[PDB]
Amino acid sequence: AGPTAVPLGTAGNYAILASAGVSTVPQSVITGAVGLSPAAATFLTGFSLTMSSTGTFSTSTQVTGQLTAADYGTPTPSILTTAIGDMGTAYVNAATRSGPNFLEIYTGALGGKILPPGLYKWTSPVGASADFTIIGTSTDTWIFQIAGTLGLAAGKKIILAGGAQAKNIVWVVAGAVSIEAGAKFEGVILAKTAVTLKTGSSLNGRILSQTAVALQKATVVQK
């Protein structure tokens, strides 16, 4: 049940892919690669980076995986350009799916709700001030199209039930995404604009932003 999968292309090689910057307030934890393009590596802030001897990637104690930026050595710039283009195609694939199953459901207030598989569209801000549950099997899919901001309140969690898995959940969000302190987020975020995770928050999925990503003492695990 649910919509056809969203193709990520080579954007599916990253835990975090951004265009304008990736910042951390240490200590954050990222499991998976971090890519940044077309911004230069100066816009990776807070990672205390060490360049590979190759000059094509860098490492941080905060990241399990490689970091890459647009001014690193060949072929990193070209690999990232392809990834950024794939992210752009993924955003448009998800954002332009037609015929939502659910339109303006709950006027965007998701706390306490149970969300079965489907294509959802909101033309408003969306948020949750309480936990909410995404329920379906391990093969079901969800696409959440959000024209406004997306917010998850402090301490609140997106709970997967039934077998639902993070790689089959896509949030395609035009406005800024805020994940408050101690919150737990699930799914792939295709963000047109910025994304922030606050202290002690976590995300299982990916953060694919066309602007900047801020990680304040936060955890991101690729799914």
Shortest distance, CB of residue 159 to Na ion, whole angstroms? Answer: 14
Applying CB under 5 A, which part among 24-32, 73-81, 125-133, 137-145 lies near Na ion? 125-133
Residue 171 forms beta bridges with which residues?
Answer: 144, 189
- Binding residues for Na ion restricted to 52-91, rule: CB under 5 A: 52-53
Breaks (C-N over 2.5 A) in the chain follow: none
Phi/psi at 91 (nearest 5 deg)?
A: -55, -50
Q: How far apart are CA 125 and CA 10, in angstroms?
A: 29
- Comparing CA positions, the residue from 156, 124, 161, 127 lying closest to residue 142 is 161
- Does 129 participate in binding Na ion (rule CB under 5 A)? yes
Judged by CB under 5 A, the residue of 20, 25, 51, 109 near Na ion is: 109
Shortest distance, CB of residue 109 to Na ion, whole angstroms? Answer: 4
Residue 214 forms beta bridges with which residues?
Answer: 23, 196
Token pair, residue 113, equals 């709700």
Binding map of Na ion across residues 19-58, x = CB under 5 A, - = no contact: ---------------------------------xx-----
Shortest distance, CB of residue 5 to Na ion, whole angstroms? Answer: 28
Length of the chain counted residue by residue: 223
Judged by CB under 5 A, the residue of 85, 88, 111, 182 near Na ion is: 111
In the complex, the residues that contact Na ion under the rule CB under 5 A are: 52-53, 109, 111, 128-129
